[PDB]
Amino acid sequence: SNKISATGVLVELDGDEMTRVIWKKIKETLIFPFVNVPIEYYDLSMENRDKTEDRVTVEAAYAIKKHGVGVKCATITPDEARVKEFNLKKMWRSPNGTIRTILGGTVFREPIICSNVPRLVTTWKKPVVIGRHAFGDQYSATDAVVKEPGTFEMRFIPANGGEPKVYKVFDYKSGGVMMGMYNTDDSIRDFARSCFEFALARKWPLYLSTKNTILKHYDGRFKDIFAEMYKALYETKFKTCGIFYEHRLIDDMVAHCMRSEGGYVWACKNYDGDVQSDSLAQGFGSLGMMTSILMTPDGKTVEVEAAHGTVTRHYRDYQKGKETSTNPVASIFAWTRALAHRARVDNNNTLLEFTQRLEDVIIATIEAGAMTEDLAICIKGEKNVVRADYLNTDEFIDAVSQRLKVAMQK
Amino acid sequence: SNKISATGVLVELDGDEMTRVIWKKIKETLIFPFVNVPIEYYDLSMENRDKTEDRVTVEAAYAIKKHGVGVKCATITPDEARVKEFNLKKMWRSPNGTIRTILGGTVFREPIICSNVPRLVTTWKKPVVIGRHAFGDQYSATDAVVKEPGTFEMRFIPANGGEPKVYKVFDYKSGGVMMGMYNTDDSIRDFARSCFEFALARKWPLYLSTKNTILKHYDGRFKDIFAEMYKALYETKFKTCGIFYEHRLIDDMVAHCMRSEGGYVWACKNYDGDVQSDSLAQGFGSLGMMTSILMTPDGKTVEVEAAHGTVTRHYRDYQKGKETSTNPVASIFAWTRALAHRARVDNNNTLLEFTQRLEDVIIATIEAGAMTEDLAICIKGEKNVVRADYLNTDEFIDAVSQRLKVAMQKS
Ligand SMILES: NC(=O)c1ccc[n+]([C@@H]2O[C@H](COP(=O)([O-])OP(=O)(O)OC[C@H]3O[C@@H](n4cnc5c(N)ncnc54)[C@H](OP(=O)(O)O)[C@@H]3O)[C@@H](O)[C@H]2O)c1
Ligand SMILES: NC(=O)c1ccc[n+]([C@@H]2O[C@H](COP(=O)([O-])OP(=O)(O)OC[C@H]3O[C@@H](n4cnc5c(N)ncnc54)[C@H](OP(=O)(O)O)[C@@H]3O)[C@@H](O)[C@H]2O)c1
Ligand SMILES: [Ca+2]
Ligand SMILES: [Ca+2]
């Protein structure tokens, strides 16, 4: 019972509403008792984001680049109703957006799985981790209606005074609609770097979906760039790891995902990752059972968080004194994942040990049958759920806490 | 009570490989012995499309437009390999894309369910019917890699002689990639008309996914057009059946599809409908249990078929001379679906009842354990099925024929 320490620092980003109440508890019960982390702490509450005029958000991001690891609690992103609620003198940009620009990199969503908790998709046994390429295809396109008959044309004008090449796209007769989109080789090459680095670190294979049958050039450039890089830099390493990479056609990927056991990383384009991430996440079940995690292209800088929001509907009931059974595992797993990275970077196996315990002690505690209300509802259905079927949030943490001590051997 | 018939006509398209052999028995066994509806027959064997330069294809399209109701056996879509196998001439176009263009409107995939055959998604208790647009967008789009540094711009050049309209799209420094797509107001309008008609006729409610969050002008146009057309011609008729039209984003809709019981028509754009139809394909179980049906904008003209292809691999065992358990139920349902549409235009409640019992009989056939391999692998899983769990194709069709004549008697 020597409490574990570290050698580098861990950047903590505190947040809002219900997840903050949960954050605080976790640190008191599942982290600070068992381990001493140096923590550079930025408070990203809405209150304190407003007070520093967002400066702490940016400060937090740069710290993550200096130090190399960050955990983030759910933070409210301000909108119109929020500016009236919290009296903000500015509608500040979503802190994730701010953070993500500065760090750069790609977001991987990895769900936590338990035996007894069933999935919507019977086949699924292991994580399917979708990486999403955020730099714009349709998200930075330029769209327009066509009210007159006429002709939609595309010019590529070379900057070295060279001859423009132009493209007949369509001659409309009645009305219509037109669009143009783009992407960079550098944005793609960074998307690729992230993916290869994540899947390698995780010791999973990597898939890539495109529709390159139809868009032989546009979607072709993705397939190629991944290929260029793979057999250059990654193929030997993956092959030592017992993993691989293949490009699949998007039509096969959805079918493969449907039919498959799982246990792989799925890298897909901006639009595809956006559409798929929601069905996929639904299918695995509770949003408390999944974590986000941005990974820069080098693979040394990581920001990690639960893939749910500040779960406000519950933060009301907590204010009103009512019992609440918000699921804390995604939050808890943000800590363990993030601390793991820290350990893997500093080559620190007492800390890397701890993270393995907690991760699996959580799965044990639910696998045995102690679970928050949402998981009960997967097993037992939404009618049928009685109070003895779920622990509330606080008594679940106290339940993983004892079970952790049990497995503090070594 | 002997054999019955109807005054309107079916339009039979003969197809090729395994599905052509199943086709031959389906008729002789399950439908012709109990139903004698007139048939303007058109053979569409890959054989014959070489022998008439893809021109029986087009003839058949216009045959259906003229007559109102087609049924189609699967056909080969010429690969570069199929050229060497059959004959040179031209590496032809797809007879599906050929007949679909000629007739206009939209294709709706509808799965068939059996209580004892599980889905991969533990909530799908009712069918989910994707209608894919199948025109424009990324499927007729121009694309280019960008090797130099330069500007990508878009010009709209009016036909009348007016001012071009230019759009600065991007300025490349390194290398990049570019693209442009169109869709037309009259393709979305006919996409819309068909869906509203189809959702109505089948008494299911109608969703439409877009991305008008992102693509305000482009996707909005779709949103606005269904909104226009719903109010002005369908919103009344929908409420007089107890159904609704709603738009959702594509994110909610795929979250919906996954968590929802089913029993709706989901109009998808050309790219969403290609992708999503494949997730639904696998999720329901077997392509043996799904029919593609093509409805024109007016909704008075249909060409129905099976969602699967010719089942080449099975046909290869048929040539070795070996046993095969190819699932005919989609092909049979393709008949009972056309004939049903033939009946509701003749007001023929006799033929309408035959189609419903035949379908009821194939369902209870499978619910009492009599089934083909694919459905055996759907229950027991790929590597745990043995010969004693499934019937071959002949045994199966014969098993339902026996079951059919008893249900004809007891009434
Ligand atoms: N990481 C981030 O920064 C991030 C991301 C997204 C949203 N948000 C913020 O969160 C706020 C609320 O957004 P929201 O309520 O739409 O999204 P949400 O927090 O994901 O809540 C949606 C609903 O999902 C259920 N849920 C989510 N997490 C859960 C958990 N851990 N345990 C049990 N149930 C859970 C709850 O349903 P019931 O009502 O049935 O209990 C909840 O009301 C917003 O102000 C937004 O800015 C932050
Ligand atoms: N006109 C059309 O309706 C249409 C549509 C799509 C494709 N096609 C054409 O069909 C040809 C063959 O393509 P394909 O083999 O990839 O697709 P397919 O004919 O749909 O067969 C795909 C595979 O899925 C399984 N399967 C499909 N239908 C089945 C059934 N009724 N019963 C049992 N198993 C079934 C079989 O796998 P196992 O052998 O593993 O059991 C089969 O080999 C191509 O030339 C293609 O162009 C035609
Ligand atoms: Ca999304
Ligand atoms: Ca497809």
**Tokens 């057999």, residue?**
A231
Please state the φ and ψ torsions of residue A409, each to the nearest 5 degrees. Answer: -95, 135
d(CA A57, CA B355): 66
Interface subset of A 3-42, CB within 8 angstroms of B: none
CB A18 within 8 Å of CB A25: no
Please say whether the beta carbons of B350 and B370 come within 8 A.
Answer: no
Q: How far is the CA of A355 from the centre of ligand 1 (A)?
A: 26
Q: H or E element: which one contains B22? A: helix B18-26
Q: Is B176 annotated as contributing to ligand binding?
A: no
Q: Is A165 left (phi over 0), alpha (psi -120 to 50) or beta?
A: beta
Contact status of A161 with chain B (Cβ, < 8 Å): no
| Residues B127/B111, Cβ–Cβ less than 8 Å | yes
**Contact by Cβ (8 Å): A144, B180:** no
Helix B216-229 with B185-201: angle, nearest 10 deg: 50
HSE at residue A192, side-chain half, CA atoms within 13 A, is 23
* CA-CA-CA-CA torsion sign (A10, A13, A14, A15): negative
- Which residues have a Cβ under 8 Å from the Cβ of B11 and sit 6 or more positions away? B39, B40, B42, B60, B63, B64, B67, B69, B70, B71, B303
Contact A271, A137 (CB under 8 A): yes
CA of residue A312 to ligand 1 center, whole Å: 6
- State whether residue B10 is helix, strand or coil: strand
Q: Which residues pair with B142 in a beta bridge?
A: B180
Partners of residue A214 in chain B, C-beta under 8 Å? 138-139, 141
CA distance B7 to chain A (A): 39
What token pair was written down for A1?
């019972």
**Domain residue limits at A211:** 1-410
**CATH assignment at residue B221:** 3.40.718.10
Q: Rounded to the nearest 10 degrees, how much is the dihedral formed by the CA atoms of B74, B78, B82, B85?
A: 80
Distance from CA of A132 to the nearest CA of B (A): 14
- Reported resolution, Å: 2.8
Q: Whole-angstrom Cα distance, residue A130 to residue A276? A: 8
Interatomic CA distance for residues B109 and B191, integer angstroms = 15
Q: In what order do the strands lie in the sheet with B165-172?
A: A165-170, A152-158, B150-156, B165-172
Searching chain A, which residue's CA lies closest to the CA of residue B121?
A: A121
Check CB contact of A145 with chain B, cutoff 8 Å. Answer: yes
Does residue B50 come out as left (phi exceeding 0), alpha (psi in the -120 to 50 range) or beta? alpha
Of B121, B126, B117, B124, residue with least CA distance to B377: B117
- Answer whether B152 sits within 8 Å of A123, measured CB to CB: no
**How much of chain B is helix, strand and coil, in % rounded to 5?**
45, 20, 35
Please report the atom of ligand 1 found closest to the CA of residue A313. 43
Antiparallel, parallel or unpaired: β B10-13 and A165-170: unpaired
Q: How far apart are CA B249 and CA B247, in angstroms?
A: 7
8 Å CB contact between B325 and B394: no
Lookup result for tokens 């008949």:
B335
Interface of B with A in 186-205 (CB under 8 A): 186, 188
Q: Do A217 and B143 touch (CB under 8 A)?
A: yes
State in Å: Cα B304 to ligand 4 middle: 18
Q: How many domains does chain B have?
A: 1
- Cβ atoms A79, A91 nearer than 8 A: yes
Q: What count of Cα atoms within 13 Å lies in the side-chain half-sphere of residue A288?
A: 23
Type of residue numbered A353: E
The residue whose CB lies within 8 Å of the most ligand 2 atoms, and thus the one to mutate among B314, B315, B371, is B314
Asked if B129 and B264 touch (Cβ cutoff 8 Å), the reply is: yes
CA distance B314 to B292: 21
